[PDB]
Structure formats: C-alpha cells, structure tokens
Design an enzyme around this catalytic site. Structure first.
Site, PDB file in Angstrom:
ATOM      1  N   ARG A  48       0.798  -1.233   0.000  1.00 34.55           N
ATOM      2  CA  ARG A  48       0.000   0.000   0.000  1.00 34.55           C
ATOM      3  C   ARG A  48       0.833   1.288   0.000  1.00 34.55           C
ATOM      4  NH1 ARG A  48      -5.693   0.509   2.078  1.00 34.55           N
ATOM      5  NH2 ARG A  48      -6.294   2.664   1.579  1.00 34.55           N
ATOM      6  N   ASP A  49       2.158   1.212   0.103  1.00 33.24           N
ATOM      7  CA  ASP A  49       2.992   2.397   0.295  1.00 33.24           C
ATOM      8  C   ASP A  49       4.225   2.347  -0.603  1.00 33.24           C
ATOM      9  OD1 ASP A  49       1.579   1.706   3.041  1.00 33.24           O
ATOM     10  OD2 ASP A  49       1.922   3.871   3.072  1.00 33.24           O
ATOM     11  N   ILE A  50       4.025   2.049  -1.886  1.00 33.38           N
ATOM     12  CA  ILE A  50       5.134   1.958  -2.834  1.00 33.38           C
ATOM     13  C   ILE A  50       5.572   3.385  -3.158  1.00 33.38           C
ATOM     14  CG2 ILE A  50       5.902   1.164  -5.089  1.00 33.38           C
ATOM     15  CD1 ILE A  50       2.894  -0.542  -3.676  1.00 33.38           C
ATOM     16  N   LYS A  51       6.623   3.839  -2.481  1.00 30.43           N
ATOM     17  CA  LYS A  51       7.155   5.191  -2.537  1.00 30.43           C
ATOM     18  C   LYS A  51       8.661   5.145  -2.747  1.00 30.43           C
ATOM     19  CE  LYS A  51       3.045   6.092  -1.755  1.00 30.43           C
ATOM     20  NZ  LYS A  51       2.792   4.800  -2.448  1.00 30.43           N
TER      21      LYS A  51
END
Ligand SMILES: Nc1ncnc2c1ncn2[C@@H]1O[C@H](COP(=O)(O)OP(=O)(O)O)[C@@H](O)[C@H]1O
Lengths: 167, 798
Positions: A48-51
């Site tokens: 959910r947090d591909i940064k």
C-alpha cells in the site's frame, strides 16, 4: 534496514550530476524491486505504500526491502474506490516514471491532479534515451481502469529478460 | 509396450541425419540472472518453484534442434536417463505450421492407431510426457499466436484448431512440459502469452571444441592439421566459427576442394561470405543453370511471404521447374527431402531460405518487408550483407549475382529505414534493425557505412557477449558519438584500439559493469598517448580498486584533455589516494571538475587534498560528496581556503559531525574566500550552534556567496528571522532549501511575516515534508505571485 542510503539519494546524485540514469542500472534496480514485491504478494501480503523514499539499498546494489491523502494516490484511491493490486501497478508506474525522467508524472492542490487523471495525461518520455519497450510498459501500467493493468507476474518476467539481456 | 517400437522409429529417424553419433560435440548453456541438460528442467525451489517449461534461445543456427535430436536419440539410446519421463514427442513447428484445424497429433506416419484414449490417461497421474516444440519462428498463419479467444477441453479428442489448442494446452491447464526452441526475436509473441518460463541461452563453439569438431569431421591427418591451421591464420572466421553452422559450411565447402587442393583460407570475411562461397562451391561446374537459379530463387520465399514452409511434395516446384535438377539440388544439399521422411521437401536450415529470400527480394516490395520486419531478422541481415559485398563482387565474382539497378534502390532505403529506426526509436530486446551487425556484414564504406556518422545520436551499444570485432569495426569508422559501452572485461584491444582513435569527437562512460583485475590496469595505454581523447569521464560503481590509481595517476599527468572524472562507489580510499594526489599535483593539468563520492575514504587523505587547490589554479569544483569522512579533517578544510585566490568555485561537502568545530571552520572560508559560489551541506547532524556560527559567518560584510543548502536540522523558531534580516541587510546568498525540518507553524509564521515586506532571498526557497496548517498556506501561495522575487516555494504534500 541497511546503512548505505536510499533511492531518493540515488536520484539526487544524478540531479547533481545532470545526467539521466542509464538503462542497465534502471533495470538492475527494477528487477530486484519486482522480485521482492512478487515474493511479498505470493505469500499474500500487500504493501500500500510503494514510494521512492521507501526504497532502501546497500552500496553493493541489493535492495534490502523495507517492511509494510498523500500525493502518490491512485485514481481509484483518490476517488476513494478500492485500493487494489492495480493500485500497486499504478504506484510502480509512477515510481518508474520518477526513476526514468527524474520526477513524478504529475509534479499545489488535488483538483487538477484528478482533472488530468480524468483526461489521462502525463508528459512523454524521450525516445532516444530509454527503451521503447519500457515506454510501452509505462503506458500499460498507468491505465485508468483497473482491468487494463497487467500484474506483477507479467511485468517481473518482462523485466527479468530486460535485465538478463542487459547484465 | 508401445515405447520401444517408436523408440526404434525415432532411432531410425535421427540416426540417419548427417551418422551424427560420433559427430556430436557438447555445447555451452548459460542462464546468468545476476549448464547441464541432465535435469535441466528442475522446478527446484531456489528461484524457480512452480515452473514446467524452459525456452532455448540463440542466434540463427546455434544448434537447438540438433541438440533436441541428440536428446531424442540419447534417451532413445537410454544413456543413463533415470526415467523422469516416459514418452517424448518431437513437434516440428514447420510441419504442424498450418491453420487448417486438425485435432491432437501423435500419429505422424499414419501407422496402426495408438492408444490415444489411454494416451491422456497416462498424462494425469504420470506427468511423464513432454512435447519438444521446435522452431517457433516459422509457426505460420499470419504471425498470429495471440491470446486465445476460446479454450479447448483437457482431452483434445475434438477437432479444435491447434491455433486454439496448442496455444491453450501450452497456456492453461497443461500438466505437461514443453521446451520451445526459438530465436529470441520471436520471444515477444511468446512473452505476453503468459507462461511462467525459464530461459536458457545456448553458446557453442569455443577454441578447443572447434578443434574437436575439425578432428571428428575429417580424417585425423589429411587436413585436420592442415585445414585447421589454414583457417586458423585468418583475422576472422575463427571468431565467426563460434556459430557451428559456419563450421559445417567450411568443412563441407572445402572437402569438395581438397580434390582441387589449396584454395581454403581465401575471401572469408562475414556471415555473408561463407554462405555465398559455399553456394559457389556447390553451384560451380554447371555455369541451362542460369534459368535454374532464377527458378529456385523465384519460389523459395513465397513459402514465408504466403507462409507455406515445407514445399508440399514440391508441387509448387512441380509448377516451377521440376526436372532432374531438383534431384541434383537434393543430392548436393543432402537434407532436403529425406528429413521429411514421407513426401515433403524443404530447405536444410531455412536460414538458407532466408538467404534465398534475400535473393528473392533482390530479384523480385522491400518496404513491405520493412513494415513486416520485427515480427520475426535474418532476411534483412543477409540481404544487407549480400548487398555491398556483391557491389564489391561486381568486380569480384561473375555478374550472375544480380540481373543491376535494384541494388541501389535497396541500399538507400536501407539507410533511410536505419535513420527511421534509430532517430525516434530505441528498442533494446526484440525489435532489431537498430543493430551494428547490419552495417558490419555490409563491410561502400565511404557513404553507406559513414552515413551513420550522421544518424548516430549520441548512442551507446551493449557488448555483453558479442565478439567485439563488430562494434570496433563500426564506430572506429565513423566520427561522432558520446558513447557509453558496457563490459569489455575479458578482451582487451577491442577497447584500446578504438578508444584511442576517437579523436574527431568523443566522450565515454563505463558505469556499473565489472571491469576485471587488469581491467583496472587496462585503458592506461589507451589514454597515455595524445591526439584527442575523453573530455569528461564517469566510472560509476565499476570494478576498480587500489592498483589502478597510480596507473591512472599517469593518465592524470599525461592528459591535456580531462576536465571531469568520477570514482563513485569503487573502494578507492587509502594509499591509492596518495598515488592519485601525487599524480594530479605532480604536473600541470587542465582538470576543472572532480568527483570522488562514496569511495571508502577517511580523514587520513585530505591533508594531501589541501595542496592541490593551492598549487593548481585549474581544479575548481571538488565534489567530494559524502564519502565516509568525519572530524579531524576540519582544520584542513579550513586551510583549503584560508588564503584568497584559491580559484575554487563550488565545494560539495560531506555528512559531518560536531556542529561547532565544522561550522567555525566554515565561517572562516565563507568570510574570507571569494569566488565560492555553491555549498551543498546535507545529511549533517546539526543544531542551533552550527546555524548560529553560520549566520555569524555571513554577518561578515562583503563576503560573497551564491546558492546554499542546509538540510538536516530541527531549528529553533528564531533563526529564520535572523537570517532573513541578514539577507535583507546584504544580498549574502540567493536561495536556500530546507528538508526534513520539524520547524513548526511559528517558524513559517515569522517567515511569511518577514517575507511580506522586502523578501530577503532573490532566487528560490524550499520547504518539504510538512504536516502543518492551511491558514498560513494561503499566505504562502498568496505572497509568491504578486512579488515573484520569491519564485518557487516547495509545497509539502497538499
Ligand atoms: N554437436 C554438434 N556436432 C556437430 N555439428 C553440429 C553440432 N551442433 C550443431 N552442429 C551444426 O549445426 C547445424 C544444426 O543446427 P540446428 O539444430 O538445425 O539449428 P536450429 O535448431 O536453429 O534449426 C548442423 O548443420 C550441424 O552441422
């Protein structure tokens, strides 16, 4: 967690250097990203947090993978629909455009971002400095509708060949 | 029970091809991802857990299907095969290649009916069945093996289309293996068709194995010592004999000339010349045949232009010139009809058919081939290599080659499509025609090779496993290009001899490959001699160590051309830095920029680096950026510009430590030293003391400074007003950025208050990663446009 640094450091380096990241290095980071992501998803764990700040690398090149409304926010998720695996494909597309052309595709406020999402716009990558197969992958991973997004099991075996022929 | 019968049948089928049991040399199998055909297909849980399929890949003629025949005859011989499998089925993809909807195919010669309703009962529990699909490049139709519209059932007794069955029983619900062999070019049709595959590239004839081939071919003293050495003494054709098909071409292209004697080593250059000379060796003593050659030419390629690969008992040739010359071509080819085993006719390896297709497109719309091109490559490569070589062999061999005016009208469109396929197209894996082979086999070297001097567009090729004779032949001819190659590890002078002669206009980068241990020690002699050479240079994370440094210290001293060099991430930090600084300090150098980031360096070398600024007035921008150095170098950093007239424009700096000592040293240089434009401090664990010493340093009047950055801090909510009042007092800097700084609402409140009247900076500002409130964000986005003296402010997340 490693102690070498992160990917955002690796883009700020070239931003100082005024040079575009060459494609062998691009794929060399991207495949060890994709294999760790598919290893995460095969055991049924989402991220959910591909940064790009959430990408942590040794000085040798191994991406020691970090664990589990912002600007990076998918068209369905910014309209508060379901965060699907197609949202992960969306974030991989935005991450790759950042590592491709040194910034994000849509980079203030959040109306006009939704407006150009509804108009399906982004600046084009140049032809002469990246592989056209990569641009076709880009156009296939920023599709608006969720059902027009190929999954990690397609793209990782794509990038495996892209890297094995660019070792 | 039925095992041994058709085991003996396949023994008879692949024994007859030539023999070929004392004529088999084992080859090399590679899969890097950074072999042995015995248990090649292991789904072992290292990194290949659920797999049921491999794909073999090499260039045109590496020996995939002859390896498959060796597998079939080998297991048909037994040969210590612990029975992982029970029944193996060769599927020739240039015989099943139609579209016309037959059902499952396991009876080939139409024998008594095999137990087919038990042939799929012995798939389900025993998964000991395997279908060697071979020859994917010529599965005909309309280049259409796409995503299947409709699937078929898992019994296949229905007469479904094999375009919709083998595609489906390949694709979904197989529970049976398949090892498709193909050129990698047609991998793309197979790629987005989802497989979860493995891949194996096939690499064959080395030096000693080629020696064993020449011994196992001939008799052991007639010419196995004479022809071996006579072909060994050529500058090419030992490299070209990596491809086993060229070895077959020459060993049966002078076996007919051992009777005439002594014509062996001659006119041997390319992949084109070996084919044309072998065809001349066959078609010599009959030129009658002047019509037979055109008849063979005019019908050979409609079997791929209209897609009918085997010539169907040569009824097409029964239309075009069926006489005893057909039997003559069959006897001199020796593998046309007999390998089809019932009635059909074919070419031997169909690179002959792509070669005769090149003859066809000489002697019969080449933009049609241009548009159809990337779905396949051999026809274009062989027609190009044919072209300038027969322009050369217009005055060479007799004028049977063209019967010309059609030759120029496909060399000028060849460079036209080359211009079209380079200038707006870079495709790295499957769309070829942007490769240097197509100029290589061409060499007429005054226009058609140096026309790519124009259409080069600052390229960079990829030499991972190619023999480097080709690109060294290519770019040493032309005169442009800011090239960035990759991995010239083992071979040496294919780097040296071409990077020396780049004197027209050049540039270089070898970043993130692994140059070997004397790969450090190579390129010394390439750069230690004058002319014109590298202007600026990068070596990013390459294989480099201590032993190079003194070596390149000499190329430090001998160069009036270097302006920017990088040693990033290569562990060059102790005792090679001594060699580097004595090489730089030793002679006068025209070096203006230097880059030494992330190399495993410490404070035990910077005392040498103090001297190089004071001596050399040319070293000007020393980005030493954030290699692992810390304290106790700090007074040496102070003595870097205690004096003025150092001629140092920028200074990238390092993640440092205790704030008071480093910023007290930095105050002296930022006060006294003129012509110091930028300063990139970043990642520095600092507090109020360091920025307080900083603003006391910039309090020094008439000290000049451009762009400055301070990134990592948790500043008190008073320093911002102090620095902005100093900047309204004097234009001491121009811009500033702030990063992960928890500076709160009160700091930006004072900031927009002091920015309301007389905006202090004059270029830019940056504030990121801030979860503060919006009532001041309205003022931030407000007061930037009416006074655009502050042009850009970073807006954090919203
Ligand atoms: N092990 C080997 N021993 C002798 N000759 C070989 C061997 N492997 C390949 N060749 C040569 O290569 C050719 C066969 O290649 P083939 O398998 O037909 O290629 P493809 O699989 O591309 O059709 C033959 O002409 C043969 O002379």
């Amino acid at each position: 967690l490693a102690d070498a640094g992160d990917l955002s450091r690796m883009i700020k380096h070239f931003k100082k250097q005024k040079r575009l990241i060459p494609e062998r290095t691009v794929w060399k980071y991207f495949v060890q990203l994709c294999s760790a992501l598919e290893h995460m998803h095969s055991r049924r764990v989402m991220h959910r947090d591909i940064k790009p700040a959430n990408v942590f690398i040794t000085a040798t090149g191994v991406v020691k993978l970090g664990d589990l409304t912002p600007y990076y926010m998918s068209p369905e998720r910014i309209h508060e629909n379901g965060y699907n695996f197609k949202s992960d494909i969306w974030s991989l597309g935005c991450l790759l455009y950042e590592m491709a052309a040194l910034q994000s595709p849509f980079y203030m406020n959040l109306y006009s971002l939704c407006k150009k999402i509804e108009q399906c716009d982004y600046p084009p990558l140049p032809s002469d400095h990246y592989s056209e197969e990569l641009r076709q992958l880009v156009n296939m991973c920023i599709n608006p509708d969720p059902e027009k997004r190929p999954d990690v099991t397609y793209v990782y075996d794509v990038a495996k060949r892209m890297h094995a022929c660019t070792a | 029970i039925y095992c041994a019968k058709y085991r003996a049948y396949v023994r008879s089928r692949f024994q007859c091809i030539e023999s070929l049991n004392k004529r088999y040399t084992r080859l090399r199998l590679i899969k890097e991802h950074r072999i042995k055909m015995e248990l090649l297909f292991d789904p072992d849980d290292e990194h290949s857990e659920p797999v049921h399929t491999v794909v073999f890949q090499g260039a045109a003629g590496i020996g995939k299907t002859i390896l498959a025949r060796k597998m079939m005859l080998d297991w048909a011989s037994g040969t210590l095969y612990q029975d992982r499998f029970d029944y193996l089925f060769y599927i020739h993809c240039r015989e099943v290649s139609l579209v016309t909807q037959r059902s499952l195919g396991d009876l080939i010669m139409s024998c008594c009916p095999d137990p087919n309703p038990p042939i799929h009962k012995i798939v389900r529990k025993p998964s000991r069945i395997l279908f060697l699909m071979d020859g994917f490049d010529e599965l005909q139709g309309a280049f259409d093996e796409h995503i299947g519209p409709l699937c078929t059932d898992w019994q296949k007794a229905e007469r479904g289309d094999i375009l919709l069955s083998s595609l489906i029983r390949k694709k979904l619900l197989p529970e049976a293996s398949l090892l498709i062999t193909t050129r990698p070019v047609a991998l793309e049709k197979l790629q987005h068709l989802l497989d979860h595959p493995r891949h194996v590239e096939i690499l064959g004839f080395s030096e000693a194995k080629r020696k064993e081939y020449f011994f196992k071919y001939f008799s052991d003293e007639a010419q196995a010592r004479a022809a071996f050495s006579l072909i060994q003494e050529n500058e090419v054709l030992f490299t070209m004999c990596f491809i086993p098909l060229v070895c077959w071409i020459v060993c049966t292209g002078l076996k007919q000339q051992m009777e005439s004697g002594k014509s062996l080593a001659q006119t041997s250059k390319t992949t084109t010349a070996v084919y044309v000379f072998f065809l001349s060796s066959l078609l010599q003593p009959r030129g009658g045949l002047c019509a037979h050659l055109w008849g063979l030419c005019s019908l050979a390629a409609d079997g791929i232009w209209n897609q009918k690969i085997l010539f169907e008992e040569s009824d097409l040739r029964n239309h075009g010139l069926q006489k005893a010359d057909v039997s003559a071509f069959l006897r001199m080819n020796l593998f046309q009809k007999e390998v089809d085993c019932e009635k059909f006719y074919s070419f031997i390896h169909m690179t002959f058919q792509e070669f005769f297709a090149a003859m066809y497109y000489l002697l019969e719309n080449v933009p049609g081939s241009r548009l159809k091109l990337p779905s396949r490559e051999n026809y274009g490569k062989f027609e190009k290599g044919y072209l300038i070589f027969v322009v050369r062999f217009l005055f060479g061999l007799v004028n049977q080659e063209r019967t010309a005016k059609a030759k120029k009208l496909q060399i000028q469109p060849s460079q036209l499509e080359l211009f079209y396929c380079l200038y707006e197209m870079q495709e790295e894996d499957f769309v070829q025609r942007a490769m240097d082979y197509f100029p290589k086999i061409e060499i007429g070297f005054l226009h058609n090779m140096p026309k790519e001097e124009e259409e080069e567009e600052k390229e960079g090729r990829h030499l991972d496993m190619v023999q480097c004779v080709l690109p060294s032949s290519s770019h040493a001819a032309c005169s442009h290009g800011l090239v960035n190659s990759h991995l010239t590890s083992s071979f040496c002078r294919g780097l040296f001899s071409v990077l020396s002669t780049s004197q027209s206009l050049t540039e270089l980068d070898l970043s993130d490959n692994s140059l070997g241990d004397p790969g450090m020690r190579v390129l010394c002699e390439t750069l230690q001699h004058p002319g014109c050479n590298i202007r600026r240079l990068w070596l990013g994370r390459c294989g480099l160590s201590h032993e190079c440094c003194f070596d390149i210290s000499l190329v430090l001293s001998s160069n009036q051309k270097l302006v920017e060099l990088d040693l990033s991430d290569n562990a060059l930090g102790d005792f090679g830095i001594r060699l580097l600084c004595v090489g730089l300090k030793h002679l006068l150098c025209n070096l203006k920029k230097l880059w030494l980031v992330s190399c495993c360096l410490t404070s035990a070398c910077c005392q040498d680096l103090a001297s190089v600024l004071s001596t050399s007035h040319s070293l000007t921008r020393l980005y030493v950026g954030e290699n692992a150095l810390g304290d106790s170098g700090v007074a040496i950093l102070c003595e870097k510009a205690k004096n003025p007239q150092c001629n140092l424009q920028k200074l990238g700096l390092v993640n440092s430590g205790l704030t008071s000592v480093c910023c007290s040293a930095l105050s002296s240089v930022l006060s006294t030293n003129q012509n110091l434009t930028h300063l990139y401090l970043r990642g520095n664990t600092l507090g109020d003391k360091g920025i307080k010493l900083l603003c006391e340093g910039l309090l020094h009047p008439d000290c000049k400074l451009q762009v400055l950055e301070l990134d990592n801090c948790n500043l008190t909510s008073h320093c911002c007003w102090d620095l902005s009042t100093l900047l309204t007092s004097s234009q001491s800097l121009r811009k500033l950025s702030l990063g992960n700084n928890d500076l709160g609402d009160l700091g930006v409140m004072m900031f927009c208050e002091v920015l309301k009247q007389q905006s202090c900076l004059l270029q830019n500002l940056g504030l990121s990663e801030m979860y503060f409130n919006y009532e001041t964000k309205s003022a931030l986005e407000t007061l930037q446009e009416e006074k655009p003296e502050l042009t850009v402010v970073f807006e954090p997340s919203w």
